[PDB]
Every structure is written in C-alpha cells, then in structure tokens.
A paper describes a structure:
Eukaryotic PCNA is a homotrimer, forming a ring encircling double-stranded DNA. One example of the PCNA-coordinated process is the lagging strand maturation, which involves at least four PCNA-interacting enzymes, Pol δ, RNaseH2 (Ribonuclease H2), FEN1 (Flap endonuclease 1), and LIG1 (DNA ligase 1). Two structurally resolved classes (PCNA-FEN1 and PCNA-FEN1-RNaseH2 complexes) have captured a series of 3D snapshots for the primer-removal steps of Okazaki fragment maturation.
The second one (6% particles) contains three subunits of RNaseH2, forming a stable PCNA-FEN1-RNaseH2 complex. The DNA in this ternary complex is generally similar to that of the PCNA-FEN1 complex, with a ~90° kink in the middle. Importantly, in all the ternary structures, the PIP box of RNaseH2 always associates with the same PCNA monomer relative to the one occupied by FEN1, further indicating that the spatial relationship of two factors is deterministic and not random. Similar to the PCNA-FEN1 complex, we found that the PCNA-FEN1-RNaseH2 complex also exists in multiple conformational states. The structure of FEN1 in state D is very similar to FEN1 in the PCNA-FEN1 complex, with both the 5′- and 3′-flaps stabilized.
Author numbering:
A (entry chain I): 12 to 87, 116 to 164
B (entry chain D): 1 to 354
C (entry chain G): 12 to 142, 154 to 189, 205 to 233
D (entry chain C), G (entry chain B): 1 to 257
E (entry chain H): 1 to 299
F (entry chain A): 1 to 256
The structure:
DNA sequence: TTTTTTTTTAAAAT
DNA sequence: ATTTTAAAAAAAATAATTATAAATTAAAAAT
DNA sequence: ATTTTTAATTTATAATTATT
C-alpha cells in the first residue's frame, strides 16, 4: 500500500491545546472532553489540578522547543491521508503527582535533540 | 393503662427473672404474638414525613408490609409465630375507653390547632398519636395470615389472654407482647421488645413467671393483686401507692381486702365503686378461646394469588415480595431443629448464693 | 470517526509544498536493524528522508479536543540519514560479490517503495565514506562509525544524558547501542575491538 | 469444707477441655456419693451429665451438699496450668466465694494453689429418666471424632440410620450427601476399635453437626463411645471413664416437616 | 449564614462559619462534631462544629435540638433560622467536596473515609482552638468503636479533653446541633448547587443523593457518559457508581493496581498458543527502554 | 461407570492438598489410557499436569469421553476425610454430573461414601512441546520446599541460574540479596539428599514466588524432583511419584 | 574484615527468633569478646542485652569496633532459614553497609549465602550496675517458661518473693489468685533439675506478666535459668549458656501505693 | 369499635 | 434524704443502599 | 496430634431515603 500525504492540510490548521491522559481508555472517536476536563482546571498550589474518574491529576505543560511543531493526524493500491490540526503546546498529566524528570515522555522530548545529532551528515575530509 | 412500671419493678427489685437473650436463641420455637398492638407499632412506626404509606387506591399499605416483613424476620431466623386478634373488648374497659376517647379528642383538637398553625413536626406527632385500628386493619391482616398459611386466631376478650390460654396448655412456648398483664393473666413466659427491628439489634427480654413467683415469693393471686395495686387499665389505682411499698404491702397482707382493712382510710381512700374483686376474677379467669379446639400447622405459603393481590390491590414491587416468600419457603425447609426441653420436666436448682 | 494520530515535527515540513502539490508521502520501508516494515516520510522538494518513531508506552492516552484517542501514540517525525537503509541493501547486494548499479541494488517485493531510494544527490558523497560500480566495504564502513560515535560523544555531552548503568569512557558504551538500533548485530558486534 | 484428691490427674483437665467450648458456666453440685454436674446450655440444644463418682477419688470428703455456681472458661484455662501428670487436689468452703485447686508435681518438687471467683448461678434441673434405647452403639471415640470433624466440612445436619449390618452417618448440604456406613465389627474382639450395635429397632433420626463438634472434643477420656439412639429421644453420647464415672452428653434430634 | 465561598470554589475544602462571640472568647466552651455526607453517593461531606457557653447547655437542651433524625426539611429550615439568631449559638463547618474525598481515597494510598473523617476532625478542632474559642469538653459521635479514637485524639490534643462515644446525638446537645447543622448545610449545598464544568439540558434537581433513592438512580443512569463517567459532583469510589462505571463507561485502568494486579507479566496464553514470540530487542539500546521509544508499525 | 480403586490414595490426598490453594475449579481429563489433569490457574500463569497412568489401580472403566467439571477446594476438603493408609475408590455416573467418592477402611471396618454435587465446567486442552532443556537439575523435594519458603522470607524477587560451581536459587529483596548454593553433583549414595545437575546452557531468569509456594505444596508426594530450566518457555518440574503417575508444573518467567 | 563462624548456631537462631517481639530495632556492637547489645523497647519499659563469648566461635577475628545497626525482624527472617544442623557463618567488611551470612551443610551440599541490609540508628548504652543480689534462684528454664505461661493467663501482675525455705510465685489477677511453691531439690543432681537457691534477705517486688512472656521466648537454647533480684533493682533473668555467652534480661519494677 | 410502653421534670408526702 | 403521683411526651419498623470493620475462618507453623 | 501465629475470609455498626 502507498499512502499519499496531502500538502494542503499543513497551512490551514488551527492552534489548540492538548492534554495527555496517564492511563488508557477503550474508546477512540468523538468525546465531550472540552465540556468537562477544560473547565475543571484549577490553578492550585502545584500547577494545574483536575480530577478524572476521581483520580487526582497533577500536571503542567511540557515546553516543546522550536524546531518541533505538533501535528494532529487522521487516517483515511494508492491511498490518501489527511490531517485536522496543528499545535505546539501539550499538557502532561500524572496521577496525583508531577512526573517531572522521571517522565518517559519528558525523556522522549530529548530524542529529536538526539535525532538532530545522530543524523547529521559527516562532511568530507 | 396496662400495668404501670411492672417491667420497671422487675428491673428494680427482682432482676433474676430477666433473661436478656438474642433473637437467634429460639431456633425452632413456637410462640404466640399479639397482632393488634404490633399493627399499632407499624402505624406509628411506618410513617414518611407524617404522611402514612399508602398505594394509589388510597388504602393503608403500611401495616400489611410491616407485619408481613415481621413474619419474614421471625421465620428466616427459625421461629414459627402464632398471631391472635383482639375482638370483643371486655366490659371492665369502660374507664380506659373513656380516657382513650378523651385523649383521641384532645389529640384531634391539637391536630386542627397545629394545622391552623402551619407547623409540620407537630402534624407528624399528632398523626402518630391519632391513627387507630378498626376492623379493616384486622381483617386485611387476617387475610394476609391466611395468605401465608401461618395460623391466626380471633381472641374473644383479650389477645394476651388468648396467648396465656395457648401457653398454659403448652401449645406455644411464650407470649411475645410488650404489654405486661399476660403474666398476670397466667402466661408463664413473656418476651419483651420482640417487635424491635433487625437493624436496631435490641436484645430480647424474657420474663418467666417461675422466677417472678420465686423472687417475689407470691402465688398468682398475690402477684395480680400487686399488679392491680400498681394499676390496671380496667379498674382504677389507689392514690399514693408506689412500686416498692406495694411489694412490701403484698408481702405483708397478701390480699386487697386485708390491705384496705389495714390501711389508713383518713389518708389513702379507694375510688368510688371500687371493683378489685371482679377485676381479680377477670385476670384469673378471662373469656379465652380453647387451645385444643384449633390445630396448629405452618403450611407452605401459596405465591401466585399472594403476588396477584399484593401487586394489584396494594401495588408493590415484584422482586421484594417474591424474595420474601422465597425466603419464607426455604426458611420453612431449613429451620427444622428440635428443642431439648420438650422431652424433660422442669425443676429449679440454685447454687450456694452467698 | 476513525483512529487519529499525533506527530511532533519541525516547521521545515511546512515550507516544502511550494514546488510539488503532493511532495510529501507516508510510506513503509525496511527497518535499518531488524529488517521489517517501519513508517517513514520522504521529501523531494527539500529532499530529506524523515523517520517516524512512536511513543508506544503502557497506559497513556490523548484528549484530542472534542474527541478522544487511546494508546498514547505520540509520533516523532524526525530526519534520518538514509545510509543505514542504503547499507542494508548494499550488504544484501555484496553477497554475490560483484559491482552492481543502483537500479538493481535496492530491490524488495515486500516493501514496494524501493524506487524512492535512487533519486538522492549526495549518494556518492555518503558512499565514499563507507565504500557506476558499487561494492560494499565493511572496513571503510567501520571507519565511518567513529565519525558518528565520537560526534555523539560531544552531542550527548550537550544533551546531558545520565548514561550510568546504576539506575567519555561511559559515552562510548552508550553510543555503542545508539547506532546499534539503526545497524544490525553483524555490524556492531565488532565495535568492542574498534573502541580499543 | 469439701476436700477431694484424685490419682489420675489429667482426667479433669481433659473433661474441662471438653466442657469449655460448649458450657460457659456450670453449677458444680456436691453429692454424698460423688460430684454430679447436670448442665444444659444457653441455647437449649444440649445437656451434659457429668457423673464424677467418689470411688475414683483418692481422699473424697463431703460436709454438706455444696453447689458452686462456677463460670467455667477462666477456671478451665487455669486448670490447663497443670501438666499431663500433675496431681489434682480440691479444697472448698461453705461460706466462700473461692474454690481452691491444688496442683502439685508428680515428683513433689512443686506444689501450687489456684483460686477463682464463683459467680453464683441458677440452673433449671431437667431430670433425665432411664429408658430402653433402640440402637446402643459402642464405637471408637477416635473414629467418632474423625467422622464428626470431617462431616463438619460437608454440611450442617447428619441423618443417622441403623440396621443389623451396621450404623449409618448420612450428612447432606449443598455439596451432596456424605453417607457413611460404619460396619458392625463383632468379628474382632479388640477393646478400642470395636463397633458393637444392640439391635432392637432400626431407627432413622437426624442430628446437628456444628453442635456435634462442640460435643465430641474429648476422645482422650475414653477411646470408645456408646451412642444410644431411639425414636425421637435425645441422644446419649457416653464418655465412660472406668472408675472416675460415666460422662454423658445429650443432643435433641432435628424434627421433620 | 455564609454560602458564597462554596459558590466561588467547591473543589477542595471550603470553610463556612460564624464569627466568635465575645463570651466564648473568654469562657471555656463545649465542642460538638457530627456527620452528614458519609451516607450518600452524591453531594458533599459536611462536618460542623457548634459552640456555646457552659451555663447555656440546659438552654440548648431546652431548645429542642436532640430529636434531629426524624425531621422534615421545612421544619429543619425554620429551626435553623431559630438557632442562627442567638449570639451564643454559633456554627463552623469545613465542607468536603466529593472531588476532595474521591481524590483522597483513590491515590497510591488506599485512603479511608474514617481516616479522612478524623483528619478533618483534628483540623477542625485545631482551627476552633486557633480562632479564640476556648473549650475543655469535646463530644464527637464518630463512626466506629471510640476508645482508640479517644486515645488518638488525646495523643494529638492533650490539653483539651476528648470524649467520644457511639449514638451520642440523643445524649449530648451539641452533637445533635452539629448533626442538624451539617444536614441543613448538605441540603443547602445540594438544593442550590452549581457545577464547575459546563453542561447542556442540565437538571439540578437530581434526587436526595442516597443510592437507593429512585430519582437519584434515574439521574445517575441518565447522566452517565462513556468517556468521563460523571462530573465533579459525583463520588467515584462507591459500589453503585463503580457498577455503572464498569457497565456503561469504557474500561479505564491505571498505572497502579486499578483492578489489574500484574507482577512479572508473561502469561502462558502468550507462551503456548503462540509457539515462539520474537525475542528481538525492540528497545535495542537502554535509552529507548528507559524513555519508552518503540519503532513504528502501521497506521 | 467408574471403578478406580487405588491401594493407597494418600497420593490423591497430597495432590489435592497441592492443588486446593492454587486452582479452585478445574478439569480432570478423563481418558482410557490413564488419568490426566490439564487446567490453567486463576490468572493464566500455571498449567497443571498430573499424568497418572491407570496401571496402579485394580481396574479401570471408562465408558465414554467424560468432560469432568470439578471444583477442587471443596472436593479436596472431601478427600481430607481419608486416612494416610486408607483405601480409596473413585466412582462416577455415566450420564449424570454427580461424582461419588468411596473410602474404605484398611481392616474392613467401615465403608464410607461421598455423593457430592458438580456442574459442567469448560474443558480447554492444549498441546505440549518438548525441547532439550538448558539446565536439568535432580534435587530433592523437601529441601526444595524449605528453600522456597526461605526465598519467600526474603522478598518477592528470585532468580534461578546454574554455573560450574553449582546452581544458585538467588533471591533479591529489600532485606538483601541472598544466595542458596548447591553442589554440581553429589557423592551421597543416599538418594533422598543427592543433588545432580545436567547442563547444556547457563542462563539466569526471574520468577514469581507465591506461585513457587503453590508449587512446593507437593512436598510429601515424592522424595526427589527433577527440574529442567530453559529460557522463553514455562518451567518443567517433574514430581515423579514412583511408577503410577507423575506431576508436572509450569511457570513462565518474569520480564526484565 | 569481621567474621563469626559457629559449628552450630542453635543458640544464635533461638535468641534471634526470640528477640523479634521484644525490640523492633536493636543496634548491635562489635566487641573484642564477641557481639554486644544494649537496647530498649518501643514503649521504653523493658531492657535486654546480648553477650556472647568469643571462645567457641570457629573464626571470630575482630579488627576494630563498629555499631552494627541491626533490624531484629531481619534477624528473624534471615535466621529462620537455618535448619536442625545448618552450620552458620558471619562475614562483613570494615565499613560494609550490609552484612553477609553463610549457612553451610554437614555434608557440604547446601550453602545459604544470605545478606541483610543495615539501618543506621542512634546508639546509647545505659549504665547498668553489677553487684551481689538479695536472692539467687536457680531452676529449670523449661519449667520456668511453662509456669510463666501458666500464671500469665490468670491476670496482669506478678509478685516475686523468695526465702530460704522456698520461692513464692504469687500472682493475683482479676479472675483469682495463684501461688507457686518451689522446693529446694539440691539432693537430686541433674543438669537443669539441680535446684540451688541461696538467700540473703527475703525481698518482694512486683513485675509484668506479658513482658515476662516476651522474656520466656528464649527458653530451649539454655535449659537452666538463674534468677536474681534485690530491692528496687531490675530483675535479671539469666539465660546463661554453658559454652556460648549469657543472656541477661532486665525489667524495671512497678510501683503500688 | 378493639394497645400501651418509655424517662422526666415534677410537686409532694413518709 | 429519699420516695413518688402526675403531668406530659416522646414514640415505636425495615428491607435496601454503601463504606468500614470484627471477631471468625482454614492454615501454616512449631511442638 | 494442639496451639499457636496469622491472613483472608464471612457477617457485623452507622448511617440515610424510601418501601408506597
């Protein structure tokens, strides 16, 4: 299978905000999450405070560096595929703790810093 | 009304008669229970906000549910009840009827006074006091006891007197009534606060007349002269006689005629037309129904006409009543233990009480 | 509706559409070490191959705005040096021990997008440091790895990686495994000799 | 002032290890010919006949017919203070709240006295009669303790039937019927592992099992137990000590409906 | 009468009270704490302290407060309006939101309603001491056997005598006063409730809150959603609530032991039905194992 | 119709003591070539194999292929009735779901019968592979149960490996990492305390511990047990009970 | 390099199983004459020490001194592995943060190389005087332990008393009273049964039953016991061992106004 | 037209 | 100091709902 | 074989509204 990527969906998308759940859910598709998760954000003593299914969620935005702009992608013998949104801000959430330097996703942020270094072309001598 | 402070008297001066048992200690035991004052218990107890629990037909579904679940609470533990219904009230109850009509009249005048006031807890209290039992409650619960097969009786004079009749012939073990005069009527074993809830977890007070007549040192006539001296509902009471001085007075003179022969008429007079002799005759010999004339059997409760009547006429839940009668049937299947005292005589035997 | 994906890519992806209308395309080619299908992205406007790496970690999910997405699938669309995928097909083509032009070097039927690997200028510039005529050289390729390992000795010095196993002389053991995810086990097992 | 001595010391420890799980308080009645304890439990399901005759005592003595109302659990716990060979000696008094229990060493290196309060009791004296029993089954008490202890785990009620060939122990519940046919062993003349059944009427009556675990807790008193059964009578469980006296345990049968 | 602090913030603990009177700033008073909110699956959890001088205990007993378990809501409101007027009757309560108790009892630590109850009780009596209310007697009818509760409260607070028992609303005046204050406070919180989140076609009239109520059950089954379950108003650790979250909502399991209980993993369903799984180091370097990087497979 | 009488069924008592804590409801594979057991545990971690050949019985009747649904805790409490030297017969009906155990006295003094209720459970048999295992260790059962209690006293992490100085049952814990060292081959002619090790490949892998304590409830079955260690497979623990039957236990390792 | 090998550490495993309920955390000391302990309990009521002489150890080489911070539940779970004849060995460094223990076999088959972690605690050694005692009582330790278990269930207090004629174990619980005479059986000459009681002044103190039940848990390492008391001093329960050190167990007396 | 318990503050006499 | 008529008055269940426990419950574990 | 020494079971208090 060959999956062509549409180039018209890169420029016209809208910035938004994204939140990352510290667990898994069985549903993929439409969900009223801005109705509940967004208005229940309380700026407490340790960042951003919210509850989902009774579990306390402490979290904050993790600073994505420039040179790294988030894209939100919808799937669609040649094939096409098409995005819907772009962003630069995502909100990590830990279950009643800030994950911090022990986060596997904050440690995953430095791998494009490695991938800008492991894949630099070596010049000729 | 009733006997004033007889349970208080046993709690004060003769505490060996009380056996504070739990409800599970009668596994396979036959006992007679007053039904009508339990209907009074379930008319003053089963009230929501002062409004009585009724269906859409406008009939009182409170006491049917309450004493149906009472039969479930006795039978799921392993006690077979016997229910007696008070029919014709005795002719000595005229002063008690006059006082009851007077408190009915002042309670209903207080009901209209509180209804004009606009309060609600006083409306709850006065509707708790006012609601009385006619023949509709009695024959509806008689149809209900026909509808499970646990037998029901119609007492000609008094329900606790019929309990005393069926326990003097040994058809049952006890009388489970919070009214005290069945001990004076002749029932040996009383059960007190058996109408308390399962969730209230109140232990049951047992009152044997053997320990009562032993610790009081009295016969039946001296004990009933003591209980008239505390005060009966039928006759009056002497002004100025307490619990303990009446106990000393029965221990001195043993009869009310010798008591008024050896009292002070200048300080302690009897009421006019005082009828302690005929009240004494009525408490020794009331008009009871014969225990051998009725046979005792606890049949399997029929279910389909039970749930038909109970969900059509009374409009209840299917699952609760069906699980209740299933619990009744499997409790009848699995509560078949036999008691050891049925095959022996009884005799007291004390220790060296020093 | 359907499943939904989250990328994290540079903004140089945005300005590579002024020449070709559909000049970006998501394909599957060979893994540089294991040898199976992995999701890559190629360019010919700016002409750099982009590798996509997923953050598939247990018990994470995304709140897409007015939607939901499970799996925690954060995709890392990052630029990749194509020489690992080149050297896989060169060591496949060196098995018969002959020179072979590039049209029939990168040939695979399971991954049918092998036509894309022949259109890159600077192919001979990368091939000079590891090896018209084309024959794979192992010993020249093991000269090229010290220009990549010791480059990442200084590069992960800026990245401040705690490379200790108690979870210069320790970065060499850590950069031993970094390229080993992109070269097979036949090429990295002799690097213990070449770290002296 | 009641004073009693006895030779085999641990027989009292074993019988009050039997009484402690079933009877919580008992009245120790002193007679002229020995000590008798006819008790009946708090739920009217059991009766225990402790005949402790004076022929088995070493130096028995009796001033009057004493009756000590005794809470049995704590004094059974301190009767457990004596050893398996320690000699048990009793001392009492008429106007006293204390019963003296003398525990002494078998080599007499240690002589100890324990006392306890005797909280006075009132016991209904249901008089046992003497009657013919249809199925008198002398049978090992170790085997009986085995059968009741592992028929505890199968259900709640055993049904005991009998015939000429043997006796039946049939316990039911949710987990089927555990019907046990004990063979009448009249062929062997062993003293302990002998099952002898008197054949008068084949009775089929049903019993309890948790309560039977409360009765059968004293197989080192006698190795054999006499089970006397008849039609709708209370059970007789006889724990015969050969010269101390005959201990009898009583259970009412379950009724049918 | 204060309620606007509940309206501006109803996520954590909120304090609703009355100011300290002049005579209670000098006299050693009495203390009483009882419960409302430990019952239902909805609503907040209210513990209250009432306070009154020592000579006024007979006046509080003559105020007809101790019969406050078989009442009606309008009569509760008018008796509340009766005891709010006098200066010697003052009430102080720290209301606990269902957010606060649900985030308490569902952490790493399996926290407890009785443990959080005594923690709220200790913070309440410490704040009552720090407000200038001198007391000597403390009467709490808390749930459980009270001897080790009294020992724990006496070890925490040695200077003030703690006297705790069971079923003490019919025995002590300030216990039933705090009980009826917490009950009318709970009904005030739920009959005038506003949420945190936004809603459409909403219904504030939900029921009494208790799980066997039919209106509460109907609301509890009609406002269930698959992705989030419920708003912040609903407790998330109770058996009816856990029943309908496992029925209607999707399977949500967390990194801790959220009904998973996995130690060691590697089930034999993945060892015998599959003959040999691939032993490839997909996390080839320890960087991708320590940072959770996996190669891409498919879309 | 069943007629399965064994001379001494304390073997059956020991295997149902060894199963009543690990598995609650399981399947007895009933076949004409012996008695087999095959069931996964409560969380699909361990499979059972009691390959009991029917040559030890007096007779063996198996009319049809019975799919036997039995719960083992309650019927283990049933089997605890039997003595150590008792004679045990197993009987079941052909068309009914009812199993009727028979216990018989050694000196024919009683006949003991246990009718007991059952329901039809699911039957899911699986195949078995066989490979030349990396490390096969013959080492006795009682000291194995002792050292599994000892490593259970350590913590909840044990690793098993072999080397040329002997096997190590190395247990790691918050108390401390401890070792149990045995000989490679024992010169003791007494077979109840002899340890010998067959080796093909030394390797170290991590195990669970409560499942190990479930495995070591088969202590009075046999004196010696042969354990064969190999990687990327469940373990094989061959409790060989003479010639009438043998017990096998499986445990897939931990992931590191 | 701290080592301690014993052919049979039965005394070690018995006292280290016994002390698991006395002190939750008891820091040891490294001495020239062996191992040393001086630790108080959690309620600060009872005092215990350990002193083992370095004669019978196989390889006891002492380099310097270090306060061995020892968790006693770690000693319970790490000397619970020792069997009937497991040959113990200790191994440590000069500044090891852990401590390794080796348990070899009589037939050299099994070796249990276990290691325990050390926890750092504040160390204090109270001043304990050594003098001559008012009454020295020597009696069997098994007999002492079983009669301590006997008269501890009767109440909560014990009255100690001794004389030249006998030794009084008086204890008056709320259930009742119980007193034990001991006779001087020095005519009988056994190892533990040779009772030798020397007396100087009859003194009477009160002590605690439940902490004596903790104290009697180290019984069968030493079949004999020496008792020794004076006026208002702690009682010294001496579990002296004829070849491996001694165990002196302390408890302060109560006050009764 | 059909049942009476419980404290308790209470005035009041042996 | 107690003893107590009398006035008044409180005043009365009960399966369902749940969280939180509490002696009970087989069972290791050691005599 | 008992009697510990525990843990993981089965029914226990304290609440509430309705149960109709």
């Amino acid at each position: 299978h060959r999956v062509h990527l549409r180039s018209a969906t890169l420029r016209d998308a809208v910035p938004a905000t994204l939140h990352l759940l510290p667990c898994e859910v069985a549903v993929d598709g439409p969900a009223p999450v801005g109705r509940f998760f967004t208005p229940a954000i309380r700026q407490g003593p340790e960042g951003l405070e919210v509850s989902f299914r009774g579990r306390c969620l402490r979290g904050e935005e993790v600073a994505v560096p420039p040179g790294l702009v988030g894209y939100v992608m919808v799937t669609e013998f040649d094939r096409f595929i098409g995005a819907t949104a772009n962003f630069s801000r995502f909100t990590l959430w830990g279950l009643e703790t800030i994950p911090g330097p022990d986060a596997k996703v904050r440690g995953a942020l430095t791998w494009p810093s490695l991938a800008a270094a492991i894949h630099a072309q070596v010049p000729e001598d | 009304m009733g006997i004033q402070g007889l349970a208080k008297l046993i709690a004060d001066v003769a505490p060996s008669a009380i056996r504070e048992n739990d409800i599970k200690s009668y596994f396979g035991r036959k006992v007679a229970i007053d039904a009508s004052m339990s209907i009074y218990q379930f008319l003053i107890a089963v009230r929501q906000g002062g409004d009585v629990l009724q269906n859409e037909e406008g009939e009182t579904t409170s006491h049917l549910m309450g004493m149906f679940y009472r039969t479930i609470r006795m039978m799921e533990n392993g006690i077979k009840p016997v229910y007696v219904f008070d029919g014709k009230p005795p002719q000595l109850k005229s002063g008690e009827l006059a006082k009851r009509s007077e408190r009915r009249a002042e309670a209903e005048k207080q009901l209209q006074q509180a209804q004009a006031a606009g309060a609600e807890q006083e409306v709850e209290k006065f509707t708790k006091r006012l609601v009385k039992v006619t023949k509709q409650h009695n024959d509806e619960c008689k149809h209900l006891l026909s509808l499970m097969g646990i037998p029901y009786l119609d007492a000609p004079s008094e329900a606790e007197a019929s309990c005393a009749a069926l326990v003097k012939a040994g058809k049952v073990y006890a009388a489970a009534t919070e009214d005290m005069d069945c001990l004076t009527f002749g029932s040996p074993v009383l059960m007190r606060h058996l109408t308390a809830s399962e969730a209230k977890k109140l232990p049951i007070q047992e009152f044997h007349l053997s320990r009562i007549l032993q610790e009081l040192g009295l016969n039946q006539e001296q004990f009933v002269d003591l209980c008239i001296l505390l005060g009966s509902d039928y006759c009056e009471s002497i002004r100025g006689i307490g619990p303990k001085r009446a106990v000393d007075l029965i221990q001195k003179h043993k009869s009310i005629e010798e008591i008024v022969r050896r009292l002070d008429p200048n300080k302690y007079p009897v009421p006019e037309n005082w009828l302690h002799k005929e009240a004494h005759q009525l408490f020794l010999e009331p008009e009871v129904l014969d225990p051998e004339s009725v046979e005792l059997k606890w049949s399997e409760p029929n279910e389909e006409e039970l749930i038909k009547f109970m969900c059509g006429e009374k409009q209840f839940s299917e699952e609760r009543i069906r699980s209740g009668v299933k619990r009744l049937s499997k409790s009848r299947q699995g509560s078949t233990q036999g008691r050891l005292d049925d095959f022996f005589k009884v005799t007291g035997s004390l220790s060296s009480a020093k | 509706g359907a499943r939904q994906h989250v990328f994290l890519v540079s903004e140089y992806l945005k300005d590579a559409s002024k020449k070709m209308k559909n000049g970006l395309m998501f394909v599957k080619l060979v893994n540089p070490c294991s040898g199976e299908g992995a999701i890559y992205l190629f360019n010919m406007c700016l002409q750099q191959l982009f590798e996509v790496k997923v953050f598939k970690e247990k018990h994470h999910s995304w709140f897409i705005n007015q939607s939901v997405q499970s799996g925690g699938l954060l995709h890392f669309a990052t630029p990749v040096d194509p020489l690992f995928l080149l050297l896989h097909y060169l060591i496949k083509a060196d098995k018969e021990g002959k020179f072979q032009p590039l049209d029939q070097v990168v040939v695979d039927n399971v991954f049918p997008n092998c036509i894309l690997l022949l259109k890159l200028p600077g192919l001979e510039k990368l091939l000079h440091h590891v090896t018209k005529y084309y024959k794979y050289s192992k010993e020249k390729t093991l000269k090229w790895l010290e220009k990549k390992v010791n480059q990442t000795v200084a590069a992960l010095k800026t990245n401040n990686v705690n490379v200790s196993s108690r979870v210069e002389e320790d970065y060499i053991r850590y950069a031993h495994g970094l390229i080993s995810d992109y070269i097979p086990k036949e090429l990295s097992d002799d690097l213990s000799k070449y770290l002296k | 002032m009641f004073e009693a001595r006895l030779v085999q010391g641990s027989i009292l420890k074993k019988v009050l290890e039997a009484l402690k799980d079933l009877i919580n308080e008992a009245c120790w009645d002193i007679s002229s010919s020995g000590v008798n304890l006819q008790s009946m439990d708090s739920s009217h399901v059991s009766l225990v006949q402790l005949t402790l005759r004076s022929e088995g005592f070493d130096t028995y003595r009796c001033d009057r017919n004493l009756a000590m109302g005794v809470n049995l659990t704590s004094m059974s716990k301190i009767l457990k203070c004596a050893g398996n060979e320690d000699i048990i000696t009793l001392r009492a008094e008429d106007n006293a709240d204390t019963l003296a229990l003398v525990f002494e060493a078998p080599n007499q290196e240690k002589v100890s006295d324990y006392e306890m309060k005797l909280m006075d009791l009132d016991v209904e004296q249901l008089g046992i009669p003497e009657q013919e029993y249809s199925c008198v089954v002398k049978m090992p008490s170790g085997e009986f303790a085995r059968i009741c202890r592992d028929l505890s785990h199968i259900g709640d009620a055993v049904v005991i039937s009998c015939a000429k060939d043997g006796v039946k122990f049939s316990a039911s519940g949710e987990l089927g019927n555990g019907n046990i046919k004990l063979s009448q062993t009249s062929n062997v003349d062993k003293e302990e592992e002998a099952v002898t059944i008197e054949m008068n009427e084949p009775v089929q009556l049903t019993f309890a099992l948790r309560y039977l675990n409360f009765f059968t807790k004293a197989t080192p008193l006698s190795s054999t137990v006499t089970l006397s059964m008849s039609a709708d009578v209370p059970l007789v469980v006889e724990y015969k000590i050969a010269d101390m006296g005959h201990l009898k345990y009583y259970l009412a049968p379950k009724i049918e409906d | 009468m204060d309620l606007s602090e509940l309206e501006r913030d109803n996520t954590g603990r909120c304090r609703l009270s009355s100011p300290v009177p002049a005579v209670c700033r000098k006299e050693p008073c009495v203390l009483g704490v009882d419960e409302a909110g430990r019952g239902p699956v909805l609503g907040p959890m209210v513990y209250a302290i009432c306070y009154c001088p020592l000579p006024r205990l007979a006046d509080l007993e003559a105020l007809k407060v101790a019969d406050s378990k078989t009442l009606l809501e309008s009569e509760r409101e008018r008796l509340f309006a009766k005891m709010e007027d006098t200066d010697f009757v003052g009430w102080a309560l720290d209301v606990l939101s269902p957010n606060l108790i649900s985030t308490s009892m569902l952490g790493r630590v399996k926290y407890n309603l009785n443990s959080l109850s005594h923690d709220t009780a200790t913070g309440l009596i410490q704040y009552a001491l720090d407000q200038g209310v001198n007391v000597t007697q403390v009467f709490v009818d808390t749930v459980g056997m009270p001897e080790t509760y009294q020992a724990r409260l006496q070890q925490s607070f040695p200077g003030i005598e703690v006297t705790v028992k069971a079923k003490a609303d019919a025995l002590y005046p300030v216990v039933s006063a705090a009980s009826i204050c917490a009950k009318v406070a709970r009904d005030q919180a739920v009959k005038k409730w506003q949420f945190v989140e936004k809603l459409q076609d909403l219904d504030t009239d939900y029921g009494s809150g208790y799980p066997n109520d039919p209106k509460t059950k109907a609301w509890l089954k009609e406002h269930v959603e698959p992705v989030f379950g419920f708003p912040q108003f609903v407790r998330f650790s109770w058996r009816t609530a856990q029943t309908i979250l496992e029925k209607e909502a999707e399977d949500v399991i967390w990194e801790d032991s959220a009904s998973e209980n996995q130690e060691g993993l590697r089930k034999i369903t993945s060892y015998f039905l599959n003959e040999g799984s691939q032993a490839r180091p997909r996390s080839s370097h320890r960087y991708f194992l320590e940072r959770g990087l996996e190669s891409a497979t498919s879309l």
